[PDB]
Design a protein around this ligand. Structure first.
Ligand SMILES: OC[C@H]1O[C@@](CO)(O[C@H]2O[C@H](CO)[C@@H](O)[C@H](O)[C@H]2O)[C@@H](O)[C@@H]1O
Ligand SMILES: Nc1ccc(-n2cccc2)cc1
Ligand SMILES: Nc1ccc(-n2cccc2)cc1
Lengths: 145, 141
């Protein structure tokens, strides 16, 4: 389970946000991209896979994931691509947009607000003052020694 | 050496700029390919990095991009203190795989992958990715 990520997209202000969620921790990575193309999606996946030990990605089976460029990237990086596998995370894509609202007036451009929201989400302590943030949870889950 | 210390440097290849952040204690790298070495691109890079890892201090080359008001605003917001080698290993790996990709940026991220995942030493060794997570997880207690 520690190598599983869920990908999804969010559209805001006529722009596309690609989001990767580490299922076990709730940690997120996101980028604003011009459109959901195979090349953009493949680049995103390649970046993510260089930064964390990514074994498996669950996707929404959008047409960007049927691109041969994305298939090639997943094969090169040793990612098992699992399309149409669903999976509180539902509450979270709604939650990123809420956080983006609380910082939007501090950023000239949307992409900056998106990275501010990612920062807030990842650093936020969950389950009270004795709890842990998504950033803390991911490193504790992944660390092997 | 401390868990929150990164070093940031630029490398120029094929008319483009590669921004490289190294986590000093582990050797782990994050990199992006940018059109030009601008204040806006530098700030965006730093905000992304700080959202992903507990970044306390970044050591830089004190070029013009790092003292931009947008960079200072990003660093103030993210709680990053600015202060004034592995570019060589990265460039080398980029060389070794540049022929497996059309675009330079694809080859750069292939090189970041290879570098971060590569076990140093024999059986018993670690990769830079394993070292950074082990160091940070230990710091959490
Ligand atoms: O959101 C656009 C933004 O992303 C950055 C990250 O620093 O880089 C881009 O990465 C590629 C360029 O190297 C793009 O193809 C990709 O869409 C995006 O991740 C910035 O340079 C850019 O402003
Ligand atoms: N844009 C892009 C990203 C990754 C690849 N890739 C394919 C195999 C390995 C990386 C190709 C193109
Ligand atoms: N436990 C573990 C394994 C691989 C990594 N890794 C992350 C990027 C490259 C390797 C991190 C932690």
């Amino acid at each position: 389970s520690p190598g599983i990520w869920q990908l999804d997209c969010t559209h805001l202000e006529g722009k596309v946000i690609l989001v990767a969620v580490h299922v076990a921790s709730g940690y997120i990575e996101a980028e604003v991209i011009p459109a959901e193309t195979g090349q953009e999606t493949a680049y995103f996946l390649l970046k993510l896979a260089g930064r964390w030990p990514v074994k498996t990605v669950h996707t929404d089976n959008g047409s960007n994931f049927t691109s041969t460029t994305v298939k090639a990237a997943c094969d090169w990086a040793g990612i098992k691509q699992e399309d149409g596998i669903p999976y509180v995370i539902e509450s979270m894509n709604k939650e990123l947009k809420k956080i983006i609202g609380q910082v939007r007036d501090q950023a000239e451009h949307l992409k900056t607000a998106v990275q501010m929201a990612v920062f807030i989400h990842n650093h936020k302590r969950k389950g009270g003052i004795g709890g842990y943030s998504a950033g803390e949870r991911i490193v504790d889950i992944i660390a092997t020694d």
